[PDB]
Amino acid sequence: MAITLNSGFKMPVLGLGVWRMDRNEIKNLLLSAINLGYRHFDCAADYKNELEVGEAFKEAFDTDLVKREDLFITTKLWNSDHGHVIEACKNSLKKLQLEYLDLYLIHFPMASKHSGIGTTRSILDDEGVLEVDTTISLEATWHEMEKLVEMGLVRSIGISNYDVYLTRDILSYSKIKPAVNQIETHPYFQRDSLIKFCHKYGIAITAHTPLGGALANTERFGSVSCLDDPVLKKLSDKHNKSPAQIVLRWGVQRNTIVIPKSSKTKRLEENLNIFDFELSKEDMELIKTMERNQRSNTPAKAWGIDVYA
Amino acid sequence: MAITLNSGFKMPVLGLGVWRMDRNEIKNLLLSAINLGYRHFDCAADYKNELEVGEAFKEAFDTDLVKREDLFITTKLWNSDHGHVIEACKNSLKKLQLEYLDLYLIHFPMASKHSGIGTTRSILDDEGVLEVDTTISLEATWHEMEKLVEMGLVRSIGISNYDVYLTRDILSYSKIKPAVNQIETHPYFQRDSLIKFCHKYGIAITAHTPLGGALANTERFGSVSCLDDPVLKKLSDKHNKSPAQIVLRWGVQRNTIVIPKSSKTKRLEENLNIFDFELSKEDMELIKTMERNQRSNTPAKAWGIDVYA
Ligand SMILES: NC(=O)c1ccc[n+]([C@@H]2O[C@H](COP(=O)([O-])OP(=O)(O)OC[C@H]3O[C@@H](n4cnc5c(N)ncnc54)[C@H](OP(=O)(O)O)[C@@H]3O)[C@@H](O)[C@H]2O)c1
Ligand SMILES: NC(=O)c1ccc[n+]([C@@H]2O[C@H](COP(=O)([O-])OP(=O)(O)OC[C@H]3O[C@@H](n4cnc5c(N)ncnc54)[C@H](OP(=O)(O)O)[C@@H]3O)[C@@H](O)[C@H]2O)c1
Ligand SMILES: O=C(O)[C@@H](O)[C@@H](O)[C@H](O)[C@H](O)CO
Ligand SMILES: O=C(O)[C@@H](O)[C@@H](O)[C@H](O)[C@H](O)CO
C-alpha cells in the first residue's frame, strides 16, 4: 500500500533506509531488497553512500529487475548545503545516476558551514562545537527547494525533523507546501501531537528510526530498544509475527510511512512481510501504553550542541 | 547590576514577573517592589493585567516614587496578534499608560487565530485544539517588530521560548538582531547548549520560571520544585541565604537575567537581596549536578497540542 501525497504522487508506506549500511554491501543489499519487493528507498547526501546506491539502481534497471518509474527514491539536503540547494540536488542526482528524485528533503532545520558540493560535513569549531550558519534562513532554503520542482529535478519536496513550531512556520511561508515531514517516531516516542498537526494540514509523516533503532541506537545513543517489550511479545505470539513486524504494522496503521533499515536480507524480507495480517483496535490501544516520549536519535554529541535543549 | 543588550540599553539582571498576580493585588505589589528597589518588570498582554500594571506605574510616577527612565518595562506580543504587531504594541502601550517600551517580545514562536486587539486569547476549535494560524511566518512578525524600533515605540525587541533552531533562523533573517531570548531555565532545566548558543551571538538570556515555578507549577504543571533539593539545603546553611536566594544568585552568575514572581512583599524583599553574597566555583558546580533537563512550564494542556512533542 501507499499514501497519496499532497503533490499527487503515491509514496509506498514501507521503504528501506540506508543509513549505516556497510558500503561494500549496499549494492547486494539494495538489489536483494528490490528483488524482494522494496520500491521506496530512503537515502541522504550525508550518508555518503549515494554512489553505491546509484550503482545498485543502475544494475537493477540493466537486469530488468525493476523500472525507474516503479521506484520511489528519496534523498536529503545536508545542513552544510542550505545555501547551495540547486547544486546539492544536482550532485545527489549525479551520484545516484538519476534524472529526477521522487522526494527531496531538508535533512534538518539546521544550517552549518558549507563544506563543498558532493562532500558534506558537520564542521566543528576549535572548541568542538558545530560551526552554525546564521546567514541562510529555512525559508530561503525552502524557496530553492521549490525551484527544483519547477525545473523538473524533483517531484515532491519536504522536510525532516521539523517540530510543531517549525512546521507551522513553513506552512506559513511556503508556496509549495511540504509533502512529507520525516521524523523519528516509534512505540517509545509516539509523538501524537506532531503527527496529528502534520496530518491536519495534509503533510505526510515518514517515521524514521521506526523500530526505535534497536541495538544500533542502544550502542550509539544509549536508547532503550522497544523490541523486547512484553507488549510486543504478547502481540508477536498472537499474530505469529516478530516484534519488529508488529511495530512496522503499527506504524502503517497509524497512517505513517515507515522506513526500517536492516543489513540482513533475512530481515529485509521479514520487515516487508507485514501486509498479510492486521492489528486490532485493542492491539493498537495496547501499543499506545508503550509511549515514553523518549527520543532515541540525537546529534547532540556529534555536533557538540544539544539542539533539543 | 544590569546586562548591556546588543541594542546598547542596560537591562537589570533581577526583575519582577507578574504572571498569575491577582488583579486585586498587582498594584500594591508593584508599588511595594518599586519601594524595595525593583526597576525591571516583566509583563505580557496575555497576563490580562496590563491595565492594573499601568495604574501602579502611573501612581509611582505621579508621586515621584521613581522616574520612567529608571524603569525597565517588558511586555509581549501574544500568539493571537502575530498579524497585528504594531496595533497590539500600541494597545499594550495604552493599557500600560506608556509612551515607549524598553523591551517588546514575541511571546511564543506560535501564531494562532486573531481574537481582537486588547483581547488576546488562545482560540480553541470544537475538539479543544488551538486554532493555529498558518499564514503569518515568524519572520514576517519580526519585520513588524523591527518597525516598532524605528517608530520609537520600543527601545529593544526580542523573542521568547525560541529554541536553538528557531534562534538560528531569526539570526539569519533579522535585520535588527533580537536583544533578548526569554526562556525557561532554572536548576532542574539548565539548558546549557541554548544559553551558550544565544550568548555566542550576543543575545541576552532572561530566565523565566527562574525558581522552577515552586508549588504553583507543581499544582499547575506537575513539576518538581527544586527548592527542597538537598544541594540547595547545604548551600543555604553555608551562605545563610534561602534556597530561593541561592537559585536566583546562581542565575545571575550564569550571566542571565532572572525574573521571579512573588505575591508576598517579604519574598519580594528576599528575592531582591541577592547582591550581598556570591556562590563559589564549587557552589556552582554543585548546582550543576541538579540538572535533570526537565521543563516545568508547558502550554500543552492550554492549547491541546504538545508543542514539545
Ligand atoms: N531524517 C533523519 O534525521 C533520520 C534519522 C535517523 C534515521 N533516518 C532514516 O531512517 C532509516 C531507519 O532508521 P534507523 O536505521 O536509524 O533505525 P531503525 O530502522 O529503527 O532500526 C535499525 C536497527 O534495527 C535492526 N533491525 C532491523 N530490522 C530488524 C528486525 N526485523 N528484527 C530485529 N532487528 C532489526 C537493524 O539491525 P541489522 O541491520 O543488523 O538488521 C538496525 O540495527 C535510516 O536508515 C535512515 O534512512 C533518518
Ligand atoms: N515567556 C514565557 O513564556 C513565560 C513563562 C513563564 C513565566 N514567565 C515570566 O516569568 C515570571 C516568573 O515565572 P513564574 O512566576 O511562572 O515562576 P517562578 O518565578 O519560577 O516561581 C514563582 C513561584 O515561586 C514562589 N516564590 C517566589 N519567591 C519565593 C521564595 N523566596 N521562596 C519560596 N517561594 C517563592 C511564588 O509563590 P508566591 O507568589 O506565593 O510567593 C510562586 O508560586 C512570570 O511571572 C512571568 O513574568 C514567562
Ligand atoms: O540518519 C540520519 O539521517 C541521521 O542519523 C543523521 O544525523 C546522520 O547520522 C548523519 O547524516 C550521519 O553523518
Ligand atoms: O507566563 C507566561 O508567559 C506563560 O505561562 C504563558 O503561557 C501564560 O500561561 C499565558 O499567557 C496566560 O494566559
CSV table of N, CA and C and ligand atoms in Angstrom, one decimal, chain B residues 17-20 42 47 76 107-108 160-161 182 208-217 227 242 244 259-264 267 270-271 297, ligand 2:
chain,number,residue,atom,x,y,z
B,17,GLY,N,8.4,39.3,37.8
B,17,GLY,CA,7.3,38.8,36.9
B,17,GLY,C,6.0,38.9,37.5
B,18,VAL,N,5.0,39.2,36.6
B,18,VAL,CA,3.6,39.5,37.1
B,18,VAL,C,2.6,38.4,36.6
B,19,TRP,N,3.0,37.4,36.0
B,19,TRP,CA,2.1,36.3,35.6
B,19,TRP,C,1.5,35.7,36.9
B,20,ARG,N,0.2,35.5,36.9
B,20,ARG,CA,-0.6,35.0,38.0
B,20,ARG,C,-0.7,35.8,39.2
B,42,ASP,N,8.4,42.4,34.3
B,42,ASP,CA,8.1,41.6,33.1
B,42,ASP,C,6.6,41.4,33.0
B,47,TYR,N,-1.2,38.2,30.1
B,47,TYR,CA,-1.4,38.0,31.5
B,47,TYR,C,-2.7,38.7,32.0
B,76,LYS,N,4.8,41.7,26.0
B,76,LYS,CA,4.9,40.7,25.0
B,76,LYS,C,3.7,40.7,24.0
B,107,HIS,N,6.0,36.5,22.2
B,107,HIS,CA,5.7,35.7,23.4
B,107,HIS,C,6.1,34.2,23.2
B,108,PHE,N,5.6,33.7,22.0
B,108,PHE,CA,5.9,32.3,21.6
B,108,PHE,C,6.2,32.3,20.1
B,160,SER,N,10.8,35.0,22.8
B,160,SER,CA,10.6,34.2,24.0
B,160,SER,C,10.3,32.8,23.6
B,161,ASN,N,10.9,31.8,24.3
B,161,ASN,CA,10.7,30.4,24.1
B,161,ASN,C,11.1,30.0,22.7
B,182,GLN,N,13.8,35.2,26.0
B,182,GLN,CA,13.3,34.9,27.4
B,182,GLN,C,12.9,33.4,27.4
B,208,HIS,N,12.9,32.9,32.5
B,208,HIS,CA,11.6,32.9,33.1
B,208,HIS,C,11.5,31.6,33.9
B,209,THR,N,10.5,31.5,34.8
B,209,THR,CA,10.3,30.4,35.7
B,209,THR,C,11.6,30.2,36.4
B,210,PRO,N,12.3,31.3,36.9
B,210,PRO,CA,13.7,31.1,37.4
B,210,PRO,C,13.8,30.3,38.7
B,211,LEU,N,12.8,30.2,39.5
B,211,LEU,CA,12.8,29.4,40.7
B,211,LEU,C,12.4,27.9,40.4
B,212,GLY,N,12.0,27.6,39.1
B,212,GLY,CA,11.4,26.3,38.8
B,212,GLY,C,9.9,26.3,39.0
B,213,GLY,N,9.3,27.4,39.3
B,213,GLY,CA,7.8,27.5,39.5
B,213,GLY,C,7.3,27.1,40.8
B,214,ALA,N,8.1,26.5,41.7
B,214,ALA,CA,7.8,26.2,43.0
B,214,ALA,C,6.5,25.4,43.1
B,215,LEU,N,5.7,25.7,44.1
B,215,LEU,CA,4.4,24.9,44.4
B,215,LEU,C,3.4,25.3,43.3
B,216,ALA,N,3.4,26.5,42.8
B,216,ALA,CA,2.4,26.9,41.8
B,216,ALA,C,2.6,26.0,40.5
B,217,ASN,N,3.8,25.7,40.1
B,217,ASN,CA,3.9,24.9,38.9
B,217,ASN,C,3.8,23.4,39.2
B,227,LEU,N,13.3,23.7,45.1
B,227,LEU,CA,13.7,24.5,46.3
B,227,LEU,C,13.9,23.6,47.5
B,242,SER,N,18.3,31.8,51.6
B,242,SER,CA,17.3,30.8,51.4
B,242,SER,C,17.6,30.1,50.1
B,244,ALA,N,15.8,29.7,47.6
B,244,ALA,CA,15.4,30.6,46.5
B,244,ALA,C,16.4,31.7,46.2
B,259,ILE,N,13.8,36.7,36.5
B,259,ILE,CA,12.5,37.5,36.8
B,259,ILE,C,11.5,36.7,37.7
B,260,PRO,N,11.9,36.4,38.9
B,260,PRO,CA,11.0,35.7,39.8
B,260,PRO,C,9.7,36.5,40.1
B,261,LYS,N,8.6,35.7,40.3
B,261,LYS,CA,7.3,36.3,40.7
B,261,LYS,C,7.1,35.9,42.2
B,262,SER,N,6.6,36.9,43.0
B,262,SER,CA,6.0,36.5,44.3
B,262,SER,C,4.9,37.5,44.5
B,263,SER,N,3.8,37.0,45.2
B,263,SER,CA,2.7,37.8,45.6
B,263,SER,C,2.8,38.2,47.1
B,264,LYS,N,4.0,38.0,47.7
B,264,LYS,CA,4.3,38.3,49.1
B,264,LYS,C,5.4,39.3,49.2
B,267,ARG,N,8.7,38.2,50.4
B,267,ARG,CA,9.5,37.4,49.4
B,267,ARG,C,10.0,38.4,48.3
B,270,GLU,N,13.1,39.4,49.8
B,270,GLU,CA,14.0,38.3,49.8
B,270,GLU,C,14.7,38.1,48.5
B,271,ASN,N,13.9,38.1,47.4
B,271,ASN,CA,14.4,37.8,46.1
B,271,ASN,C,15.3,38.8,45.6
B,297,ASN,N,7.1,24.5,32.7
B,297,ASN,CA,6.0,25.2,32.1
B,297,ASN,C,5.8,24.7,30.7
C,2,LIG,N1,7.7,33.9,28.4
C,2,LIG,C1,7.0,32.9,28.9
C,2,LIG,O1,6.5,32.0,28.3
C,2,LIG,C2,7.0,32.8,30.4
C,2,LIG,C3,6.6,31.6,31.0
C,2,LIG,C4,6.6,31.5,32.4
C,2,LIG,C5,6.8,32.7,33.3
C,2,LIG,N2,7.2,33.9,32.5
C,2,LIG,C6,7.5,35.1,33.3
C,2,LIG,O2,8.5,34.8,34.3
C,2,LIG,C7,8.0,35.1,35.6
C,2,LIG,C8,8.4,34.1,36.6
C,2,LIG,O3,8.0,32.8,36.3
C,2,LIG,P1,6.9,32.1,37.2
C,2,LIG,O4,6.2,33.1,38.0
C,2,LIG,O5,6.0,31.3,36.4
C,2,LIG,O6,7.7,31.0,38.2
C,2,LIG,P2,8.8,31.4,39.3
C,2,LIG,O7,9.2,32.8,39.4
C,2,LIG,O8,10.0,30.5,39.0
C,2,LIG,O9,8.2,30.9,40.7
C,2,LIG,C9,7.0,31.5,41.2
C,2,LIG,C10,6.5,30.7,42.4
C,2,LIG,O10,7.6,30.7,43.4
C,2,LIG,C11,7.0,31.2,44.6
C,2,LIG,N3,8.1,32.0,45.3
C,2,LIG,C12,8.6,33.2,44.9
C,2,LIG,N4,9.6,33.7,45.7
C,2,LIG,C13,9.8,32.7,46.6
C,2,LIG,C14,10.7,32.5,47.7
C,2,LIG,N5,11.6,33.4,48.1
C,2,LIG,N6,10.6,31.3,48.4
C,2,LIG,C15,9.7,30.4,48.1
C,2,LIG,N7,8.8,30.5,47.1
C,2,LIG,C16,8.8,31.6,46.3
C,2,LIG,C17,5.8,32.0,44.3
C,2,LIG,O11,4.8,31.9,45.3
C,2,LIG,P3,4.2,33.3,45.9
C,2,LIG,O12,3.7,34.2,44.8
C,2,LIG,O13,3.0,32.8,46.8
C,2,LIG,O14,5.3,34.0,46.7
C,2,LIG,C18,5.3,31.4,43.0
C,2,LIG,O15,4.4,30.3,43.4
C,2,LIG,C19,6.4,35.1,35.4
C,2,LIG,O16,5.8,35.9,36.4
C,2,LIG,C20,6.3,35.7,34.1
C,2,LIG,O17,6.5,37.2,34.2
C,2,LIG,C21,7.2,34.0,31.2
